[PDB]
Nucleic acid binder design. Structure first.
Length: 117
RNA sequence: CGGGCUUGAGUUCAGUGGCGGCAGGCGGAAUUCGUGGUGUAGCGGUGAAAUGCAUAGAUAUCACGAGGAACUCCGAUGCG
């Protein structure tokens, strides 16, 4: 039981190891999602623009045939491929409205986990 | 030993300044846990992997709730 009428929000959660693209309606209810690991890029190449393009194309094709036409992009986390995903969901029928970087930064919060040697 | 002086020293008055100390209040970002909604094939991690968590419903996303800790930019100087 979902209902996405005309416009929605795309969420990209990237990191140094993987990228997850998830499209949702105005109430943040996900209708489709994809990732490099889902596409089958289990390697160091999970953080590749090609993998991001493949995942974004799959997600956009899966979600376009549901009434989704316009989307607003939110991006969290670093990593190559966010631009590729944005371009792919822009060119796969879905029209982008704005690009918003919601990457969370701390105002000196909790302690980071040590340092690798 | 006795007397004198104002430069040392101290007291007063004024100006200016500070992450200087102790104590009480208040705040936002982030993180963790629980509850509910959407959704399903993976997430996480490495030089590469596995252990680990997941169809008895994870990662992701939205809302409600709870608690602890530290204070981005200013910001390299200043105080003791």
């Amino acid at each position: 039981v979902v209902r996405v009428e005309a416009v929605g929000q795309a969420h990209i959660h990237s990191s140094f190891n993987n990228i997850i693209i998830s499209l949702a309606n105005s109430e943040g209810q996900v209708i489709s999602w994809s990732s490099a690991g889902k596409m089958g890029f289990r390697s160091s190449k999970k953080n590749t623009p090609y993998a991001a393009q493949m995942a974004a194309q799959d997600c956009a094709k899966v979600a376009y045939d549901m009434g989704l036409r316009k989307v607003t992009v939110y991006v969290k986390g670093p990593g190559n491929g966010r631009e590729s995903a944005i371009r792919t969901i822009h060119g796969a029928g879905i029209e982008v409205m704005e690009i918003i970087d919601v990457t969370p930064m701390p105002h000196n919060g909790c302690r980071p986990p040590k340092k690798r040697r």
